[PDB]
Amino acid sequence: PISPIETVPVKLKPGMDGPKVKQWPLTEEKIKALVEICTEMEKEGKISKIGPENPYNTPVFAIKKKDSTKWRKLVDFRELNKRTQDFWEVQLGIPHPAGLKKKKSVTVLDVGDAYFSVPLDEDFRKYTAFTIPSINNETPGIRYQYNVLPQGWKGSPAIFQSSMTKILEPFRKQNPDIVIYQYMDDLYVGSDLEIGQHRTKIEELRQHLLRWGLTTPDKKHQKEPPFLWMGYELHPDKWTVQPIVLPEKDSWTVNDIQKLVGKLNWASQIYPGIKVRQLCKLLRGTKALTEVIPLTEEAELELAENREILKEPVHGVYYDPSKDLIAEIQKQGQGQWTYQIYQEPFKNLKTGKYARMRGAHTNDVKQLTEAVQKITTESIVIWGKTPKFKLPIQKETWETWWTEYWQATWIPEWEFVNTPPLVKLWYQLEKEPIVGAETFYVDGAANRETKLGKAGYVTNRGRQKVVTLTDTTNQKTELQAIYLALQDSGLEVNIVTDSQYALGIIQAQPDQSESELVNQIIEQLIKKEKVYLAWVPAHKGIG
Amino acid sequence: ISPIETVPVKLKPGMDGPKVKQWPLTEEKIKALVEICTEMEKEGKISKIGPENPYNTPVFAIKKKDSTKWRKLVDFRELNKRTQDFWEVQLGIPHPAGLKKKKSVTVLDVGDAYFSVPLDEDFRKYTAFTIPSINNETPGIRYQYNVLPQGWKGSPAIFQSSMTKILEPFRKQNPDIVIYQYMDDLYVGSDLEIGQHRTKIEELRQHLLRWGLTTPGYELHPDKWTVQPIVLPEKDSWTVNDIQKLVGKLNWASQIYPGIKVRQLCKLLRGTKALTEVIPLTEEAELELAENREILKEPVHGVYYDPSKDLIAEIQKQGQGQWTYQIYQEPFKNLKTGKYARMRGAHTNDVKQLTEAVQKITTESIVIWGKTPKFKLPIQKETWETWWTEYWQATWIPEWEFVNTPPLVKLWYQLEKEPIVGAETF
Numbered sequence: 005p006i007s008p009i010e011t012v013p014v015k016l017k018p019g020m021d022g023p024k025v026k027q028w029p030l031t032e033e034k035i036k037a038l039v040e041i042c043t044e045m046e047k048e049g050k051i052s053k054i055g056p057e058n059p060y061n062t063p064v065f066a067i068k069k070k071d072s073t074k075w076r077k078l079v080d081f082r083e084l085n086k087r088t089q090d091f092w093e094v095q096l097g098i099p100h101p102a103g104l105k106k107k108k109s110v111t112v113l114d115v116g117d118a119y120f121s122v123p124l125d126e127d128f129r130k131y132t133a134f135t136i137p138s139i140n141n142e143t144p145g146i147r148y149q150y151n152v153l154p155q156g157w158k159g160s161p162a163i164f165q166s167s168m169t170k171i172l173e174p175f176r177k178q179n180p181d182i183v184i185y186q187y188m189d190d191l192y193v194g195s196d197l198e199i200g201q202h203r204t205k206i207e208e209l210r211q212h213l214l215r216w217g218l219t220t221p222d223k224k225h226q227k228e229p230p231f232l233w234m235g236y237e238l239h240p241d242k243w244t245v246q247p248i249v250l251p252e253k254d255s256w257t258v259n260d261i262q263k264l265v266g267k268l269n270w271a272s273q274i275y276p277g278i279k280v281r282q283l284c285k286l287l288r289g290t291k292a293l294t295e296v297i298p299l300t301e302e303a304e305l306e307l308a309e310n311r312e313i314l315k316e317p318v319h320g321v322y323y324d325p326s327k328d329l330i331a332e333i334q335k336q337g338q339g340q341w342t343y344q345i346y347q348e349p350f351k352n353l354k355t356g357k358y359a360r361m362r363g364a365h366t367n368d369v370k371q372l373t374e375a376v377q378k379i380t381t382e383s384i385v386i387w388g389k390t391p392k393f394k395l396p397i398q399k400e401t402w403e404t405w406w407t408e409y410w411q412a413t414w415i416p417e418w419e420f421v422n423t424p425p426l427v428k429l430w431y432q433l434e435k436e437p438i439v440g441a442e443t444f445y446v447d448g449a450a451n452r453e454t455k456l457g458k459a460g461y462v463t464n465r466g467r468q469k470v471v472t473l474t475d476t477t478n479q480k481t482e483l484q485a486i487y488l489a490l491q492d493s494g495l496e497v498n499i500v501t502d503s504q505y506a507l508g509i510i511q512a513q514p515d516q517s518e519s520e521l522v523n524q525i526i527e528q529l530i531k532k533e534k535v536y537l538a539w540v541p542a543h544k545g546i547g
Numbered sequence: 548i549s550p551i552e553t554v555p556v557k558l559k560p561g562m563d564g565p566k567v568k569q570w571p572l573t574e575e576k577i578k579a580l581v582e583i584c585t586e587m588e589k590e591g592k593i594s595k596i597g598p599e600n601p602y603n604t605p606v607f608a609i610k611k612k613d614s615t616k617w618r619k620l621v622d623f624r625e626l627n628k629r630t631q632d633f634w635e636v637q638l639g640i641p642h643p644a645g646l647k648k649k650k651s652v653t654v655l656d657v658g659d660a661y662f663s664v665p666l667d668e669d670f671r672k673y674t675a676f677t678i679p680s681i682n683n684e685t686p687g688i689r690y691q692y693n694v695l696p697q698g699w700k701g702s703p704a705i706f707q708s709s710m711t712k713i714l715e716p717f718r719k720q721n722p723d724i725v726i727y728q729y730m731d732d733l734y735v736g737s738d739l740e741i742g743q744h745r746t747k748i749e750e751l752r753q754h755l756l757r758w759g760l761t762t763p764g765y766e767l768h769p770d771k772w773t774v775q776p777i778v779l780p781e782k783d784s785w786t787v788n789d790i791q792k793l794v795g796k797l798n799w800a801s802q803i804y805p806g807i808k809v810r811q812l813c814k815l816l817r818g819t820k821a822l823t824e825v826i827p828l829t830e831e832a833e834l835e836l837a838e839n840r841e842i843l844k845e846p847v848h849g850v851y852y853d854p855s856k857d858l859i860a861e862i863q864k865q866g867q868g869q870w871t872y873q874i875y876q877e878p879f880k881n882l883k884t885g886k887y888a889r890m891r892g893a894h895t896n897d898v899k900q901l902t903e904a905v906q907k908i909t910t911e912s913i914v915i916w917g918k919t920p921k922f923k924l925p926i927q928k929e930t931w932e933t934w935w936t937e938y939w940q941a942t943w944i945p946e947w948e949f950v951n952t953p954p955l956v957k958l959w960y961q962l963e964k965e966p967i968v969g970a971e972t973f
Contacts, residue, residue, distance in 0.1 A: 012597050090601045092675070093568070095683060103682035162598040165686055185684040192684075377929055381571075388574030388681040408866040410952050412897040412926035414934070437788045437822040445819045464819045498822040500791070511954040538822060540791045541798045544813040 006049035006151060007123055007217030009167055014128040014159060015089045022060045022131035023083035027145060030137040034066035037075030038136050039146065045077075046148070050120065054149045060133035081157045084131055091162035099187065101236050101243040102345070102353035103386035106322040107183065107194030109202040110238070112231045113210070113220050116189035119164035121217040122153045132157065161188075168218075175212055179205065243320040245274060250311050258295045261286055268310060273356050276342050277313045282306045321351040323387060329353075331379050331391035335427050338368065338516055341375045345383065345391055354386075364518040365508065368427045369405045372397060376415045393418030396426045405429060410511050430515045431529045434536035441496035441534060442467070444489035445547035448481030459484040461499075462547075467492065479505060483521045490528035490535075497535055502542040510537050548591035548694050549663035556670045556701055558629050564602045564673035565625040569687065570932070571679055576608040579617035580678050583608070584690060592662050593690040600691065602675040607936040611656070613763065620698070620936070621676055622944055627700040629673075638707040642917035646725045649736030651744045652767035652914060655752070658731025658942055660710070660760040661695030661702045674699075697731050698942055717754050721747065729913045731942040733762075736769070769914055771970065774883050777843050777962040779836065788822045790815055796962070797839060799955045803879045804842045811835040850880050852916065858882070860908055860920035861950075862901070863957045868894070870904055871960040874912060874920050883911065886963055901926060902938045909945050921946040 016022065030038070045051050065078040124132070132150040153160035168186055176184060182205060185192040193209065195202055210220045230237035235246040248271060250264065265283050272278040282302040290297065299307065327347040334342050339360035346352035358375055372395065380390045395418050406413055437443075443464045450457020450473065459481040460470030469488060473481055482503035489499045505522075508514075515526050529535060540546040558564060572580075587593045605622040633639040646652055666674070674696055677687035695702040703710070710728060718726055724737035724747065735751065737744055744766070752762040777800075782789060794809050794816070801807040811832035820826075828836075853876060862872040868889040875881040887907060889900040905922055912920045924931060928949045 012599050014599060089599070091598045092601050092603060092677070092689065094598075095679075095686060097683045099682040099684055159598075166598045169686055186686070187683070374927075374929070377933060381929075381933060384573055385571045386682050388572070388577065390573070406897065410864055410866075410925060410954075410957070411930075412864055412901045412924070413930060414895075414897045416934075437786070439821075439823045443820065443822045462819050464821050464824075500822065507954045511952075511957075536822070538788055538791060539795065540816070541795055544794070544798075544809070544816070546791060546794070546813060546816040547819060 005121060005217050005219065007121055009122060009171070009216055011123050011125045012163055012166065014125045016087050016131075017089055020087045022133075023062050023087060024060060025063055025080070025083045026061060027135040027137055028063050028065065029141070030066065032139050034075060035137055035139065038064060038066055038077055041075065041077045042136060042146070042148065050152050051148045051150050054130075054133060054147055058130055058133045058147065058149065060131055062132070062134050064134045064136065079132075079134055079154065079156070081132075081154060085156075085158040087131075088158040091159060094161050094165070097385070098234065099185070100354065100386045101233065101238060102320050102323065104192075104238070104243070104322050105183065105194070106241070106324060108196040109199055110192070110194035110229070110231075110240075111202070111206045112227055112238075113191040113193065113206075114189055114225075114227055115168070115191045115213070115218065115220060118168070118189075118213070118218040118220075119153050119160050120155065121219065122160075122164050122167045124150055124152050124154070126151075171213065171216055171218070175209055179208075182209075184209075241322070243322070245318040245320075247317070248314055250307065250314065252311075256286070256297055256299060257293070258287070258290050258297060259293045261297060264307075271314065272359075274318045275313050275316075276336075276355065276357055278310055279306055321346070321348070321353055323347075323353065329383065329387055329389055329391040330394065331383065332394040332421055333372070333375055333379070334396055334423065335368070335372075335425055339366075339371050341371075343375065343379055345379070356382075362516065362518070365512060365514050365522075366517075367405075367429075367513065367515045369397065369401070369429070370409075370411075370413065372427050373413050373415055376418075380416060390416055394421035395419075396421060396423060397428065398426065401428055430526070431513065431532075431535070433510055433513055434534055436536070437498050437538065438496045438534050438536050441498050441536070442493055443498040443500065444493060445500050446485040446489045447502070447547070448473075448478075448483070448485035450476050450478045450481045452478055457481040459488065461485060461489045461492075479503075480521060482506075483519075483525065487521065487525055487528065490525065490532070493532075495533040497532065498538065499535070500538045500540055500547060502540050502546070504539075506537060507539050510539065548665060550665050551663075553665045553667040554705055556667050556705075557631055558673070559631050562629045564629060565604050565623075566601060567603055567605055567622075567625055569603065569605055569677050569679050570607065572608065574681055576617070577678060577681065580606060580608050580619060581688065583617065583619050584678060584688065588690065590662075592694045593692050596675055596689045596691045598689075600672050600675050600689070602673050604674065604676050606676045606678065607939070609936055609939050611763075611940050614940075620939065620942070620944075621696060623696065623699045624944060624946065626673055630699070630701050633701070633704045639704060640707065640728050643725050643727050646727050646734055646736050647769045647915050649725060650738035650768075650770050651741070652734050652736035652769055653744070653748050654767070654910070655733040655735060655748075655755075655762045656731055656942060657710075657728075657733050657755065657760055657762060658697035658702070659763075661697055661706055661731075663759060664695045664706050664709075666692055666694050666696070670701075698944075700730070703728055703730055713755065713758050717751055726751075727914075727917065729917060729943070734767075734914060736767070767910065767914065769911075772883075772885075772911065774846060775885060775963045776845065777959070778964045779840055779843065779962065784825050785828065786822070787816065787820050787824045787826060790826065791822075792958075795955065796959055799959060800843075803847050803881075806842050807839055808835055809839075846881070847879070850875075850882060852876070852882055854916075858912060858916055858918060858920045859923065860912065861923040861956075862887075862904060862908070862925060863952045863960065864897070864901075864925050865957065865961055868900070870900065871957070871963070872904065872908055873960065874908070883915070884960065884963070886960075886965075896938075898926075898930065898934045899938045901931075902935050905945060905947075906939075906941055909941070909943070912945075919943065919945045921948065923948055923950045925950060925952045 062084055063080045066075045067078050069076045129149050132154055135145040135147050137145045153163055172184060181195050183194055193206055197205060213220060230239050237244040237246055261283060265280050268278050268280045286297040286303055324347055329347060331343055331345045336342055341358045344352045344355035376393055383390045399420055444461045446461035448459030455475050457476045458470055458472045462468045486499060486501055517523055604626055607620045608617045609620050611618050671691045674692035675689060677689050679687040695706060714726055727734040755762045790812055794812055797807050797809040811829055812835060815826050815832055856876045858874060858876055860872055860874045862870055865871055870887045873881050873884040887904045890903050893899045909919050922945055924947050926949060
């Protein structure tokens with residue numbers, strides 16, 4: 005029902021006019037239906053007939069939703085919404101169940117339709133105008149306007165939540181134990197009061213909201229634990245993952261395989277073990293969404309082993325502020341990481357995975373740093389704090405690497421957890437030239453336009469080689485030059501190049517790239533006992 | 548809030564107010580800000596706002612010098628930029644080209660003084676900030692400002708006439724001492740001996756407590772900031788590699804001093820020899836160093852500050868605690884250059900070290916030019932945005948960009964001269 009709540013002023017988008025999109029022609033039936041819905045809606049004080057002086061409009065539609073098989077009313081605020089101002093960000097970020105504080109009792113009220121009880125800025129009410137079509141066209145359709153936050157109007161969400169906040173202000177301070185959380189159509193009330201008191205309390209709240217027009221459904225349409233959440237079942241002392249199923253069948257469309265690959269990937273976070281390589285493979289060279297791709301043995305298998313992991317259940321523990329927040333991370337392959345955040349062993353609040361990018365130029369300690377970091381952000385967001393870290397890296401290693409890296413980089417307080425594979429430094433360019441090691445003056449170059457070039461080297465001790473490349477680039481020749489020197493030397497080499505990319509590799513000593521060639525080079529680089537890379541400028545007589 | 552009169556401030560033509568997302572903070576910070584902000588609301592300075600105001604400006608919370616209780620830091624950078632400049636004639640403080648030449652400077656946070664001046668009702672919308680909540684359990688607490696905000700460019704502007712009056716009786720008294728005002732702080736220098744300097748600061752602090760605002764060893768020393776020279780290696784004997792390293796630097800430097808010549812050196816580099824091999828120096832290559840060392844004995848002729856052009860500062864991590872930077876405005880034309888060594892304790896935090904320098908470097912950019920430099924930071928966006936405020940201790944925030952240090956720029960500036968011992972103590 006309408007209310008004694010302070011309306012918020014609303015304006016249109018920078019110099020704009022209200023919508024004037026004529027009413028579609030309706031069925032005598034669809035009309036009747038709408039009129040009735042309307043005389044009802046009018047009297048609950050939600051809308052009010054208006055007239056010719058209102059020039060505005062939006063189309064009203066009639067959907068016979070066979071859910072209650074009567075005609076439901078729909079109003080297309082699409083156009084009004086394009087012309088409505090902007091509001092501050094309706095803060096997006098679903099809270100995470102593992103960030104919920106464990107309350108001895110918890111209640112969750114669906115304040116859904118509460119928004120239809122918040123009045124609209126009386127000045128803006130002219131824009132939400134609409135019409136009910138007459139049968140004998142060009143006979144005045146019955147015209148109206150909303151006195152309340154319309155459903156599907158740009159502002160309703162923004163406004164309703166602020167109203168709810170002001171309305172809850174009193175109670176929230178009148179009850180410093182009552183922890184209430186507001187989000188979309190949901191009020192989460194949890195405390196450590198005894199069942200009976202708490203119950204009583206939820207009743208106070210509900211009356212209080214009834215005090216301003218916000219009616220809460222209480223018996224016939226209530227919500228009893230567990231409480232749902234996009235695939236969450238809140239419980240008393242754990243949260244659960246509403247099971248998810250992989251649509252079984254034997255006629256897989258491209259659509260179906262994408263969506264599938266979709267759910268599978270969404271799942272891989274809380275279900276480390278889900279793999280999708282062979283399902284993705286069925287996508288190769290496809291020519292249509294409806295294209296039916298038969299599955300290889302492997303797809304079937306993987307797709308099968310996955311239904312297994314899902315059959316399983318992932319429980320979670322709640323936040324106990326009196327306890328440590330911890331985060332362990334482990335490396336699943338070069339650049340793929342898993343972590344789990346817990347306070348007491350095995351009782352974890354959250355777990356996750358980061359299938360990485362395969363950057364154009366990196367190293368593992370660097371990527372570790374980046375996972376630590378994304379975690380940290382995520383922790384702070386959920387728990388307002390940052391976990392003590394447990395990581396698969398010796399400390400001398402952190403040290404050895406970061407104290408000298410060119411980039412500023414850091415990882416907050418942590419401890420080394422010795423559970424493999426440990427992340428470390430695959431190679432380490434020497435600091436000074438290697439004495440007694442051959443010195444390969446290398447060089448390569450190519451007709452940038454015809455793409456033919458050569459690459460090779462010459463050494464202080466006699467050896468030499470040269471190759472002629474086809475469909476190459478100056479960069480690649482310069483590189484192959486170093487490759488061959490690596491290939492043809494002993495365990496200790498001193499190599500000299502004037503390739504600037506080699507200037508990079510010395511600074512950043514990569515261990516993964518985009519170039520197969522640079523990779524070969526990392527491979528060869530790891531293979532030696534000592535390798536000193538010296539750079540010298542070009543066209544000068546160095547070598 | 549002290550309801551005197553407010554001047555009708557507005558935004559630069561065409562420009563719209565700020566809509567910057569809020570960084571999420573830790574619980575310790577949301578708490579303090581909630582508390583801090585609660586008082587100010589009642590003290591009338593700021594007031595809760597609805598959702599119909601689409602602006603926003605980030606808030607952070609830090610722990611300054613003696614801050615053993617949290618301070619509040621709003622990031623007005625985007626607003627400041629959008630705020631119409633202030634030079635129709637004046638009330639926009641000029642640059643007293645002498646605090647630099649001054650024997651000692653002390654910084655004084657006097658931003659407090661703004662609360663007692665109301666802010667044009669019409670501008671307030673653009674001052675919207677939001678205190679967020681943990682795990683998004685609740686909407687943020689949106690406020691607005693009713694008074695001059697600390698850290699806004701328009702603030703020390705409007706409160707010009709009054710800061711002048713506050714200062715003359717001391718200024719007009721001691722003209723052998725300079726007082727410069729940048730944003731929320733006051734830079735104060737004089738040649739007086741240590742005690743004679745600190746004492747007069749005290750006096751000034753009285754004059755300000757006395758008037759209507761607290762004025763919250765270490766002081767600056769603009770007399771000692773020497774712009775340093777590059778010094779090339781000088782081994783008794785050179786190797787193919789020593790010459791090759793030397794040679795790459797010289798060939799890069801020729802972008803500054805075009806008379807840097809590397810020919811008679813490059814000559815010694817012909818032949819496929821043991822990188823570890825020794826080679827005697829040709830008497831020509833010998834003088835060529837000589838002539839190179841000479842070109843290097845001074846800053847390039849012609850660098851002059853252009854106030855209309857943005858001032859740029861670049862830092863390069865040198866590892867082992869050291870860093871290097873260069874303020875300049877056009878490539879290769881360095882206004883200043885220097886080396887910074889990490890603060891005590893800062894050993895395990897690159898971010899600490901980095902913010903500490905952006906700060907110290909930004910100080911000079913104010914002392915010297917009276918404005919802040921846009922930094923080129925050898926750090927990841929994410930790595931910085933995540934932990935910089937944890938160590939911020941200043942009222943102003945500079946501008947920045949994240950960059951990739953060219954290996955050679957670093958190899959070069961690392962060369963800079965150092966003392967035989969230093970700036971010692973008995």
